[PDB]
Symmetry: D2
Subunit: 457 residues, 4 copies
């Protein structure tokens, strides 16, 4: 069942109970491509943004208080998520986000109409605005909130979890591995201290993007000039947004043309997430390798069991969380390539890849925030080390000859390693058999202590 609405292009049938109107409905028919629309956090940002602009228009005497207040209230319902099903437009819409901007304007208009107030989607709800500043503004608010409120806290949990293991396993000695081959000793704690640093550096990486990710185009209107917006509109809206969200990271664009002609801050932000994905692949890979076996692998640690491993092989349990982490990392990398391709494809006063860039960036924030916390809590926290096996692994490496270098030289040392392996004997035995002692017996032992070799801080 339908009603008639119109826009400047003509009449359109709209579902009778839909709060959207003509232009939203055209976009429904124009872009049935993915059948996925804006995310919760994007719809929220649009709501907050519309509320903020209405407030400033009210403050400056440009918009009737009754209309402003109903727009602010309607926008608030949208921001709170009462109307997400009134946002049916595909991600793959016109690249400025015009359609979703109008979708927000029209839904506000219909909510306000239901509360006794007549507001025009363009003339009132979109007063002093364009899609060309509002859609990227909403995108950067969403991205900034995602970075500050979701990803960074999630990474901090993961960091804490890894650092707790770095401390716990401080003196848990094991064989280092380089090139996958037997190396000199390290501690399990040292390795986890490395993983913790990768995550801490990741936090630094996301933070370093915030000064430019938090820039908002708001106020630049159609092409960056601010035509049809009053003086200092952008700064005024940003102040309301900072006041309402608590996100001090939000700010006016340094250059209002760069802020609309490009989405360079989104490409920058994705680069930090892609680096985090690179770090997480290494961390997760190492952990599932340490967990491998129980009998045909490394069996250095035990990961917590999360579910039955195999529909066919009874009793098997698999490192499912590292698998989720590594698959997420692939998605972030894919998403990152999509973001950059769109970023490079701007023209003159507007980059028209915003919805695709937003979808991909926001998804990477989400996947990384959610999988980092799960990895920390359902995997890292419950890892159990096989301490005795690990100490044997350390004492078995041939490369425990390495600290004898300064006393016998690299070349004689290598002769000890090749002879010890062909005999199935120890490094201590091959050197004492080689007649090298005389380098004392007491000195050979001190240098061959594996935990001393790891050089624990």
């Amino acid at each position: 069942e339908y009603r008639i609405e119109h826009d400047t292009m003509g009449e359109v049938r709209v579902p009778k109970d839909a709060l959207w109107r003509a232009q939203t409905q055209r976009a429904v028919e124009n872009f049935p491509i993915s059948f996925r629309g804006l995310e919760r956090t994007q719809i929220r940002a649009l709501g907050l943004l519309k509320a903020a602009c209405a407030q400033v228009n009210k403050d400056l005497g440009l918009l009737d208080p009754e209309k402003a207040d109903a727009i602010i209230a309607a926008a608030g319902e949208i921001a709170e998520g009462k109307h997400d099903d009134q946002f049916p437009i595909d991600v793959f819409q016109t690249g400025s986000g015009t359609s979703s901007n109008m979708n927000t304007n029209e839904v506000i208009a219909s909510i306000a109409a239901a509360n006794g107030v007549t507001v025009h989607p363009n003339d009132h709800v979109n007063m002093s605005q364009s899609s060309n500043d509002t859609f990227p503004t909403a995108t950067h608010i969403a991205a900034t909130e995602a970075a500050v409120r979701h990803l960074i806290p999630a990474l901090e949990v993961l960091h804490a979890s890894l650092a707790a293991k770095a401390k716990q396993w401080r003196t848990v000695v094991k064989s280092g591995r380089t090139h996958l081959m037997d190396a000199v000793p390290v501690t399990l704690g040292q390795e986890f201290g490395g993983y913790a640093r990768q995550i801490e550096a990741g936090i630094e990486r996301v933070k370093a993007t915030l000064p430019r990710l938090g820039e908002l185009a708001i106020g630049g209107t159609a092409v960056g000039t601010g035509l049809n917006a009053p003086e200092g509109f952008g700064a005024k809206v940003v102040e309301v947004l900072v006041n309402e969200t608590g996100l001090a990271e939000l700010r006016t664009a340094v250059d209002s043309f760069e802020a609309q002609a490009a989405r360079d801050g989104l490409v920058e932000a994705s680069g930090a997430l892609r680096t985090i994905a690179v770090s997480l692949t290494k961390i997760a890979n190492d952990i599932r390798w340490m967990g491998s076996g129980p009998l045909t692998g490394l069996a250095e640690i035990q990961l917590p069991d999360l579910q039955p491993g195999s529909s066919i092989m009874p009793g098997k349990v698999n490192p499912v969380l590292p698998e989720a982490v590594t698959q997420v990392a692939c998605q972030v990398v894919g998403n990152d390539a999509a973001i950059a391709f769109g970023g490079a494809s701007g023209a003159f006063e507007l980059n028209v890849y915003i919805p695709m860039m937003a979808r991909n960036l926001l998804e990477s924030f989400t996947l990384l925030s959610n999988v980092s916390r799960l990895f920390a809590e359902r995997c890292i926290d419950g890892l159990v080390a096989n301490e005795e096996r690990l100490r044997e692994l350390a004492e078995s490496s041939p490369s425990i000859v390495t600290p004898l270098n300064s006393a016998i030289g690299y070349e004689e040392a290598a002769k000890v390693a090749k002879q010890a392996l062909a005999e199935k004997k120890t490094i201590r035995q091959t050197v004492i058999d080689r007649g090298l002692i005389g380098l004392s017996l007491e000195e050979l032992d001190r240098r061959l202590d594996v935990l001393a070799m790891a050089r624990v801080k």
Copy 2:
């Protein structure tokens, strides 16, 4: 409200009215990452696959007909899409798809239980199977159906639409452009014939991947050896699948270890789609450029109006379909990088990136199928050429001097072009003024006819 179920790891609370059971529910708790589960076409493939395996197990006397028939019927309900909301597991699950495989087994078990029949998710519904052959099998069935039944037909519509314009605009002469600068004449029809060829070559590209995309692991069970599956199980299941789906492209794997240790056919298939995305970016870019203006751009053609252009600038209309196409192309490129990263990350007997690879590949098929048809029908078909403007564009290029090369030589020709531009005069005038005629007057004209210059077939 909940009930108790168990698996080999213990007891799990499951929603009372959920048709899934213990293992699905663990996966719900283990992988809340993206909150997007399997697509319609993946759930379908799993249903068909389970029906087919049950039939073969019935045929070989290994599975009680009453149990087989209830599994076949239950699987059929799943295949038809009656139970998509009983598949809540995240894409970012264990990388073999164990969880979704078990999700299918458990939902079938609960449907059959409701019809008076007791079938064990492992012992019966998963008889002769592993996730390690079934999940990639379902993925390759979905991908192959997507290629054959959706993308290729969509591309054929787009091809027809472009070729119709190649014919329509056969003698519509215009200035060619190289490096974005004035070149010798072409016809609008020639350009569209190029775009049509890119799409035809795209069809060829997808087709060329089908011999390996259509390979199915079915029968290789846990590691590729076929343990716990009867002799020729895979060939038998493939026959049922070919019979039921009509997809002759489906086939047994050439090597049953390669078919599980890798997903190389998915990377191959994505390469063809990425090439199509590269082609579509060029086609769409050209079309929006030809459509640019109306007064400050090229204004060669007019694209059909699809919606009001701008919330702020009245009357403006934008090339929204080319924007959808180019954004889709970015997504396909991103998806393609994700697919390849997962593809490269296999280990020993199993690549455990299947759900992420499947999600990305299937999405690229979908986005490309849907946007290609929209582009054909809502853009290409209604394009209107500005024939008189185009003929003036052709006759204005300085490079119409080019066919005089053989008569006056490259160097004197260049002297004609530089003098004609500094005077604001024609090529004919600059050559006759330059005293070159005597090369006759009649010959200069014949060579300067622009439509003859385009060399129409």
Copy 3:
């Protein structure tokens, strides 16, 4: 020391002994970016191409035989590699390859001048041509020769080497691994048969691209119309090229506009190489993992020693060839993303990313051809299996309980696996202790034979 030359833009100083002239020298000054110029195979292709065009121009009476013959001879010296140091222009030149085309024309002119014959770089050496058909033509000849004469033979060596191991290790039983965890048995030969299939499929993949990679633009001249080229020039040049090179894969473009407006065949070809890189990462990773240790890893095989492992740790030797292979695979993936970005960026009658696309594609052919042969000969051929260790690995996996499923059911089977691991006892012992026999004693043994479990063909 310098001489004066000119072109249509004016006078340029050129080194006195340089065979290039004005336009090459401008490009030297215009593009000092990478300081790497065209590859041997590109210079060759340009030489052959110029010889072929001169021959056809001779055949058709359009070019004086004395001038044609000196151009053919000069071009032949270039093709043979006598003048590579006369090609100093950067890869990062004008995107049509104009500069390298002119570089070839000018060097031919100067060689011919030294043999008593005066040929104009444009009017004679470039007769019936543009850079816009010749540079992509030379690029596709180079790419096709690389595929047919270098990569495919190299892959065939690698395929043979892997298949020889598949045969050699047919009955060398070992534990399969899925998710990195203990699985049911396979043979080392089965795994290598998988790797061999990945390489055979790679061969198929490159072959499948040849019908479109081998398309040549030759004849389309400036914009694809063939202006200033005689009728059937392209077909005539292609015939000479096929006659001279033996490459039957070379052919005229299906559509002469698509063949210049895009380089879609180069993106297609790169997709096949990227798939090969994905396959090689898996193969190489597995091999270095099987080689890992000697004491802290898997120690399944021994790779041939190629050089001392470590400047610091005496005696260590590392899998350096797998490292070369995996790093090459990264480069191919990078190169592939560069190729596609350029491919998508065409405009109207010409894609002007050709030199960058050519550089990247040709490098991927080279790296893959060279590393595949080295990997085959210096690694794969000399691999030695640790047969006794491998048979113990197979017999230790808990998942050897799997073939008891049909007799005792998945759930009781899992109870056997969990009890056997907590006891440090065998599967046979845990089932006989569990009172399951009575499933006979003779049947338990037959099902527990590990080589029978691998299901060798």
Copy 4:
């Protein structure tokens, strides 16, 4: 002609006059893959690094002053580039850089031998070191010097050039374009101010990576523990390096395991360069579009002529510098994907993709530094604007109706735009004809002034 050398693996023939020795020569035979070796800046870094380590070993009494001083002198010759042809090892070597590390040690040994001093490549030249800390150290020194001394200054020139045009063209009014369609007015200067900001933000982006790019592994030796290196060796070497190079950005690693197990700082650094490539594609694209024509394009500006455009079309000149910039941007994007793939592929105590990551990152620094300066000086500086054409473009856009919105409302405004285009009349005429005046005659004019519309600061 050859001599015999040996290493711990045995005897190797080495060219008689080569300064390298056994291990370098094995690497020559082991890795003939790309036939491109280390860059000038990498060889330099290795030289400086070896000099610095020798100095510290001297300072601590661990290395004989005569041997140290000859190593410092030899290393200095290498650093200065006297011996680049003594570094023949392929980029695609063992992924730790062992071979190039040994190549440096052996060349120093042979130089010192020629000066009367016998130093052992391992025992002396490599004293207190591993490849595992030295090769990444040299890589990060090279990358940091490239960022600080080459790229940032090059970007500052480009920034100055763009900002000079932003100032010059402050009041040069033109039509804005969004979606490629006619928009409201901007100034050419505003657009260039946007491009300048993208470059300034790029500078910020590279700077933001320096705190982690400048971290050096030096001191962590084999696995990060510092075994066989004295206490505070790393800090001591870093101090010498900072003293010698002036690069205060160089620093000790925050965590010595993260600094060898990963190359996350290289992926981070590449992300900043990839963002710069995205920005440069937009800037260059816009500029070649503004330059397009002269008769069939936008013809907004004139780029400086750099070389004859076309071998075939006389007189044509093409935007060759924007083409070089956009092709470089593709290469940086490709390189960036290669870097990240290698970065993600670390294992335990060592990421063994260093040479490939270094090659790609250093090339991106180089291409971007060189093309940015060329673009600034040979393109941007000499751009000439077509001021009268531009003012007509501004006054022709239909969207000059936009500032009437607040007076007549969006819907009536759109009626003015559609009627003005169908009539071929002006906005002023269509509104006065529409009877809207009465909104006064004087007010319509003030709002329709195009330079006032651009809102110049």
